[PDB]
Paper text:
To perform a deeper analysis of the amyloidogenic properties of the identified PAM4 region, we next synthesised a high purity (>99%) peptide corresponding to this segment (matching residues 350–362) and characterised its ability to assemble into amyloid fibrils in more detail. Specifically, we were able to identify 2D-classes containing potential two (65%), three (28%) and four (10%) protofilament polymorphs assembled from conserved core folds. The structure of the two-protofilament morphology (PAM4 Type 1) was determined at 2.6 Å resolution, with a helical twist of 359.32° and rise of 4.86 Å corresponding to a crossover of 125 nm. Each protofilament contained six PAM4 subunits, giving a total of twelve subunits per layer of the fibril with each protofilament comprising a head-to-tail ring of PAM4 peptides. The lower abundance, larger fibril morphologies of the PAM4 peptide fibrils could not be resolved to high resolution but appeared to contain the same protofilament building blocks as PAM4 Type 1 with increasing assembly sizes. All four of the PAM4 fibril structures are inferred to be left-handed from the resolution of the cryoEM maps, as well as from cryo-electron tomography (cryoET) reconstructions of Type 1 fibrils. Interestingly, the folds were interchangeable within the different fibril types, with Type 1 contaning FoldA and B, Type 2 fibrils containing FoldB, C and D, and Type 3 and Type 4 fibrils containing FoldC and D. In the FoldA-FoldB building block (seen in PAM4 Type 1 fibrils), the FoldA subunits are similar to FoldB but bend further around the GS region to cap the end of the adjacent peptide chain. FoldB PAM4, which has a flipped N-terminal compared to the previous fold, perfectly matches the 4R PSP-derived tau fibril cores and shows a C-terminal mismatch to the 3R PiD tau polymorph.
Functional tau is most abundant in neuronal axons where it binds to microtubules, assists microtubule assembly, and is essential for the structural integrity of neurons and for axonal transport. Here, we identify a new amyloidogenic segment, PAM4 (Polymorphic AMyloid segment in repeat 4), encompassing residues 350–362 of R4, and show that it self-assembles into amyloid fibrils. Cryo-EM revealed that PAM4 fibrils are highly polymorphic, and, remarkably, that the polymorphs formed by this segment in isolation recapitulate the conformations that PAM4 adopts in polymorphs from different human tauopathies. In all cases, the folds share a C-terminal β-strand (residues 358–362) but differ in the way they orientate the N-terminus about an intermediary GS-bend (residues 355–356).
Residue numbers in the entry:
A (entry chain J), B (entry chain V), C (entry chain h), D (entry chain W), E (entry chain i), F (entry chain K), ...: 350 to 362
The structure:
């Protein structure tokens, strides 16, 4: 597996 | 698997 | 699998 | 639940 | 649920 | 739960 | 106001 | 105001 | 005000 | 606003 | 705002 | 605001 | 038993 | 039993 | 038993 | 009131 | 009132 | 009041 | 309110 | 209110 | 309020 | 058995 | 048995 | 047995 | 969730 | 959920 | 959760 | 048994 | 048994 | 048994 | 991305 | 990215 | 990234 | 195999 | 194998 | 094997 992610936001308000 | 993702938002308001 | 995604929004208001 | 209220008056007279 | 209310008056007189 | 209230008056007279 | 009232309920949910 | 009241409830949830 | 009241409840949750 | 939700799932695979 | 939620899941795999 | 939540999970794998 | 009474008058004149 | 009464008058004149 | 009474008057004149 | 009564019963169950 | 009564019964069940 | 009564019963259960 | 109940079962299996 | 109930079962399996 | 209850079971298995 | 329940209420009034 | 419950209420009023 | 419960209330009023 | 199992065999050979 | 199973075999060979 | 199991075998061979 | 296997999963929920 | 296996999982929930 | 195994997991929850 | 591959062979002879 | 691969062989002979 | 691989062979002969 | 090749490319994306 | 090759590339992404 | 190679690359990402 080769992965590239810029930004990751997992948010609960 | 080769993946490229710019931005990922998983949000609950 | 070769994937390219610009922006991903998974949002619940 | 996402909520927005400007003004709220619960008044007994 | 996404809600927007300007003004709310619950008045007994 | 994300909430925003400007003003709230719970008044008995 | 100048009344005879058994039960008075002024409620906001 | 100038009344005869058994029970008075002014409630905001 | 100038009343006869059995029970008075002014509650904010 | 008066809201009741049994179950909520906001999921990204 | 009066809210009741049984269960909530905001998950990214 | 009056809120009741049974369970909450904000998880990133 | 779940009961709610506003006013009760048991009066003999 | 689930009961709600506004006013009750049991009066003998 | 769950009971709520505003006012009670048991009066003999 | 100004009467002749053998038995007087004013009962609320 | 100004009467002759043998038995008086005023009952609320 | 100004009467002749054998038994007077004013009861609230 | 006058109530008479023989047996009451509120059960979750 | 006059009530008479033999048996009451409120059950969830 | 007049109440009479034989047996009360509030059970969670 | 694989079970998922959001909310459960077993209530007697 | 594999079980998941958000919220549970077994209540008698 | 594998069990997960968010909240539990066994209440008698 | 109410469950009853007589026997269970999860076997790899 | 009320369930009854006599026998269960999950076997890989 | 109410559960009853007679026998359980999780065996790797 | 006498095999070439990449991944083996024998699962019971 | 007499095999070549990368990953073996025998799981009961 | 007489095998070459990378990871072996025999788990009961 | 949610992916599942049984077997992959990238072979140059 | 959520990925599952059984077997991978990148072989040059 | 969530990844699961059974077996990996990067071999040069 | 027994050949004359300038460039060899065996790629899996 | 028994060849004359300038460049050999065996790549898995 | 028994060859003449300028560059050999066997890569797993």
């Amino acid at each position: 597996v080769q992965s590239k992610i810029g930004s990751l936001d997992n948010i609960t308000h």
